[PDB]
Paper text:
Many of the mutations found in these variants are localised to the viral spike protein, which binds to the host cell receptor angiotensin converting enzyme-2 (ACE2) enabling viral infection. Here we use in vitro evolution to seek mutations in SARS-CoV-2 receptor binding domain (RBD) that would substantially increase binding to ACE2. We find a double mutation, S477N and Q498H, that increases affinity of RBD for ACE2 by 6.5-fold. Binding of RBD to HuACE2 involves three key regions of ACE2, the alpha helix between residues 19 and 42, residues 82 and 83 and residues 353 to 357.
The complex was imaged by Cryo-EM to produce a good quality 3.2Å map for which we could build an atomic model for the complex and observe the new interactions across the binding interface. The dominant variant recovered had the double mutations S477N and Q498H and was designated S477N/Q498H-RBD. These mutations are located at each end of the binding interface with ACE2. Examination of the structure reveals mutation of RBD Q498 for histidine results in a perpendicular Y-shaped π-interaction between ACE2 Y41 and RBD H498. In addition, RBD H498 now lies within hydrogen bonding distance of a flexible ACE2 lysine residue (K353) which would strengthen the interaction in this area. A neighbouring aspartate side chain (ACE2 D38) could also mediate a hydrogen bond via a water molecule to RBD H498 and this is supported by a continuous density between ACE2 D38 and RBD H498 at lower contour levels. On the other side of the interface between ACE2 and RBD the gain of a carbon atom from the RBD S477N mutation places this side chain in hydrogen bonding distance of ACE2 S19, whereas S477 in the un-mutated RBD is unable to reach S19. In S477N/Q498H-RBD, N477 and H498 are positioned at each end of the RBD binding interface and work together to stabilize the RBD:ACE2 complex, once formed, as indicated by the more than 4-fold decrease in Koff observed for the combined mutant. In our experiments WH-RBD binds Hu-ACE2 with a KD of 9.3nM, whereas S477N/Q498H-RBD bound Hu-ACE2 with a KD of 1.4nM, representing around 6.5-fold higher affinity of binding than WH-RBD. H498 and Y501 are in close proximity and the local arrangement required to accommodate the phenolic group of Y501 will be constrained by the imidazole of H498, reducing the advantageous π-π stacking between Y501 and Y41 in B.1.351 as well as perturbing the H498-Y41 interactions. Thus, the negative epistasis between Y501 and H498 results from this conflict of their side chain ring structures.
Numbering used by the authors:
A (entry chain A): 19 to 615
B (entry chain B): 338 to 358, 364 to 386, 394 to 515
């Protein structure tokens, strides 16, 4: 009759009630996604509303159990997860205002479309629209026009809405016993009550800054190389001692540098390793791709996929017969029901994506044996890391030759290795400074270090001193550049990508060491390595019951993040870049501008 | 053994059916997922206890096993001298939208003694304040229904279990 037994009984009831209230919602959502009809939409909405009502009622019931008189860590974690009230802490009027602001911001982002004065009647949306121009066009004027137009409309529209959003979210976070909303976001990594594994919210900022400072030289060399190739592309627009313009980074926000590959390819004569033609020649289907992925996951040691996976999954595209959006997604409907929904085609990219979603489903199957609430990753950056390490293992040339997809006489020339490493760099290293900058700006904006009249100035100072990117057109206080991004204007955390990359490389190095692989880390394949599978599964079966530090120590032997694996993955490329940067200025000057130079 | 293994519908595990009744053609069916005999092999008063449980709880129908099914629904002695037969019935006992007919007791004050059947639906009194027959804080109905669906996993699919006690 003690509080411990009462909480245990309440959780016993809640685990059984939560199942089949989440399964029905999952089934309705799956039916809506696979079969797009209005009745399916209504069924999905009804199921979601019922599940949300059940969740709020259970939270209200669970708030009556104090955490002071609880001695078990699992019960305490479940009650902490359930008791969390969130936005309901505010008044009804405040909640309605916040919901209206969030919905208005999302709608303004989605419907936003800039139109040139020459023909206002016909103009481009965001997708594909300006994205195609920012990815494929080589015109300085067109790129600058698209960038400036999208900013001048979207940021001006979302500025006061973002200010009100910041105020309301700060109020909600303060009402929930937090310093600010940034503290609320950093609370996803808090560990407490465990000896030798505690992790504070204030430690996250310190760790991120330390790892970024350790990463900086490689980013500087990559930035210098990209700037040299860009000056080759753009003769009289980019200074050799200054930063890069924001509208020449290959995409809309400078988040990724992949589209710069064609401009910055080291050896254009040598082609990339693309096996699409071989896949077509061998008559490979989506079922074949998924069977090879399952075979790889069986070889590494993880079990094979259930029969229901092969009978209820939408591995192909039904066609015009029935409409279905097929963003590639792994579904855990509950009660041991796992599915994958994606229009798998005959392409190496689809091959890697199939392995990625297969790894997601394997991780879900691994932690499905835990109680309902404790059925997520230990922290928010583990699922994606697992998927990406599966993709890296599947993408290696050794695996391609072993599965019968690359000719045995293929020579792994070091030029191809450099090209692959530079592509990986443009994809991975070029986004870490952007993520760090954006999260730091949002955190100190929530904190209050940046007054409302210094948002744009501090934003562009961070662009200049951290990312090494300069704005092409002067901006004022009527602009809100961060809101132009999807995550910022849709209330989404962003440090997950940084932590995910770090965890990705740590896991890869750990499994390669377990697999007894000799040589470069980028030529590593964990195939046929049962010990790596054992370590991986031992980490995966914990769910979120144990602190993420404990799982990190289980895999890599370290309790915290580390960038040494990331620097080891790019060592050949780092040496090559240092060789090519002997006669170029490594760094940037935060004074030069395209308009003030 | 006719209606024992080929009944139209089986009973709930808490209200498990008990019937008083050549063990070769039964073993050679080659269609039973579990045919575990304790003490006496099939080749070498009889009670037939029939019910339906979840797929992953079949292992709880063995002597010396913990779990809610053994503690509160169906307990066997450690000196069991019979056989336990379990087979999947996904086609029979599952339907689109769920089959909520089968029930099981989730809460009790104490564990069932061997070969005990409990049917009373008295409101569980978890806390100190009396429930007074009304569900509320620290007051839960002890019986919960299985959510059997065709698309459930093998560990969540319905399983028909018959226990032969000699
Ligand atoms: C999709 O939904 C429509 C109407 O809800 C229905 O007629 C059709 O049979 C469904 N498709 C499938 C494959 O069940
Ligand atoms: C917490 O409860 C679980 C069962 O719910 C038990 O296995 C575990 O030993 C308990 N932990 C502590 C520290 O009492
Ligand atoms: C794994 O072992 C199988 C069976 O011996 C073999 O066919 C396959 O090529 C091996 N894979 C690797 C990457 O060595």
């Amino acid at each position: 009759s003690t509080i411990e037994e009462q909480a245990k009984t309440f959780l016993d009831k809640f685990n059984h009630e939560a199942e089949d209230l989440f399964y029905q919602s999952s089934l309705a959502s799956w039916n809506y996604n696979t079969n797009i009809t209005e009745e399916n939409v209504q069924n999905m909405n009804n199921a979601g509303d019922k599940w949300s009502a059940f969740l709020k009622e259970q939270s209200t019931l669970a708030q009556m159990y104090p955490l002071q008189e609880i001695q078990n860590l699992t019960v305490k974690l479940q009650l902490q997860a359930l008791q969390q009230n969130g936005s309901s802490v505010l008044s009804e009027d405040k909640s309605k205002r916040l919901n209206t602001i969030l919905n208005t911001m999302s709608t303004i982002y989605s419907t936003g479309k800039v139109c040139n004065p020459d023909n206002p009647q016909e103009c481009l949306l965001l997708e594909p629209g300006l994205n195609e121009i920012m990815a494929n066009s080589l015109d300085y004027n067109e790129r600058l026009w698209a960038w400036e137009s999208w900013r001048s409309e979207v940021g001006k529209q979302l500025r006061p809405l973002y200010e009100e959003y910041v105020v309301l979210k700060n109020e909600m976070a303060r009402a929930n016993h937090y310093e600010d909303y940034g503290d609320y976001w950093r609370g996803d990594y808090e560990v407490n009550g465990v000896d030798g594994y505690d992790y504070s919210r204030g430690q996250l900022i310190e760790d991120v800054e330390h790892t970024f400072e350790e990463i900086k030289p490689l980013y500087e060399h990559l930035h210098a190389y990209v700037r040299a190739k860009l000056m080759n592309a753009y003769p009289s627009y980019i200074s050799p001692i200054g930063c890069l313009p924001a509208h020449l980074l290959g995409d809309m926000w400078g988040r990724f540098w992949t589209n710069l590959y064609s401009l910055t390819v080291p050896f254009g004569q040598k082609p990339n390793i693309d096996v699409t033609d071989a896949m077509v020649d061998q008559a490979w289907d989506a079922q074949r791709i998924f069977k090879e992925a399952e075979k790889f996951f069986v070889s590494v040691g993880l079990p094979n996929m259930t029969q229901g996976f092969w009978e209820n999954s939408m591995l192909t595209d039904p066609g015009n017969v029935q409409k279905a959006v097929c963003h590639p997604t792994a579904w855990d409907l509950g009660k041991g029901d796992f599915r994958i929904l994606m229009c798998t085609k005959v392409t190496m990219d689809d091959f890697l994506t199939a392995h990625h979603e297969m790894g997601h489903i394997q991780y879900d199957m691994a932690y499905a044996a835990q109680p309902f609430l404790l059925r997520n990753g230990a922290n928010e950056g583990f699922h994606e890391a697992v998927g990406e390490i599966m993709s890296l293992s599947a993408a290696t040339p050794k695996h391609l030759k072993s599965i019968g997809l690359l000719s045995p006489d293929f020579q792994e020339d070091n030029e191809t290795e450099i090209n692959f490493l530079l592509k990986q760099a443009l994809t991975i290293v070029g986004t870490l400074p952007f993520t760090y900058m954006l999260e730091k700006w949002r955190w100190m904006v929530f904190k209050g270090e940046i007054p409302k009249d210094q948002w744009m100035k501090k934003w562009w100072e961070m662009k200049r001193e951290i990312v090494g990117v300069v704005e092409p057109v002067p901006h004022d206080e009527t602009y809100c550049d961060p809101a132009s991004l999807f995550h910022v204007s849709n209330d989404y955390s962003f440090i997950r990508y940084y932590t995910r990359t770090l965890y990705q490389f740590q896991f890869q190095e750990a499994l390669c060491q377990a697999a007894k692989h000799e040589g470069p880390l980028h030529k590593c394949d964990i195939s046929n390595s049962t010990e790596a599978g054992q370590k991986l599964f031992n980490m995966l079966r914990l769910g979120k019951s144990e602190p993420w530090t404990l799982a990190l120590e289980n895999v890599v032997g370290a309790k915290n993040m580390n960038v040494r694996p990331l620097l080891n993955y790019f060592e050949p490329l780092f040496t090559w870049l240092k060789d090519q940067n002997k006669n170029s200025f490594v760094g940037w000057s935060t004074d030069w501008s395209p308009y003030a130079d | 053994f006719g209606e024992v293994f080929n009944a139209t519908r089986f009973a709930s595990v808490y209200a498990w059916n008990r019937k008083r009744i050549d063990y070769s053609v039964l073993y050679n069916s080659a269609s039973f997922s579990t045919f575990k005999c304790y003490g006496v092999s099939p080749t070498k008063n009889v009670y037939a206890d029939s019910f339906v449980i979840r797929g992953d709880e079949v292992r709880q129908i063995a002597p010396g096993q913990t779990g809610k099914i053994a503690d509160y629904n169906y307990k066997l002695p450690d000196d069991f001298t019979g056989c336990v037969i379990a087979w999947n019935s996904n086609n029979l006992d599952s339907k689109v939208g769920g089959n909520y007919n089968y029930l099981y007791r989730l809460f009790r004050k104490s564990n069932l003694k061997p070969f005990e059947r409990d049917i009373s639906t008295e409101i569980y009194q978890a806390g100190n304040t009396p429930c007074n027959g009304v569900e509320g804080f620290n007051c839960y109905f002890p019986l919960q229904s299985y959510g059997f669906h065709p698309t459930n996993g093998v560990g969540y699919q319905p399983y028909r279990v018959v226990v032969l006690s000699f």
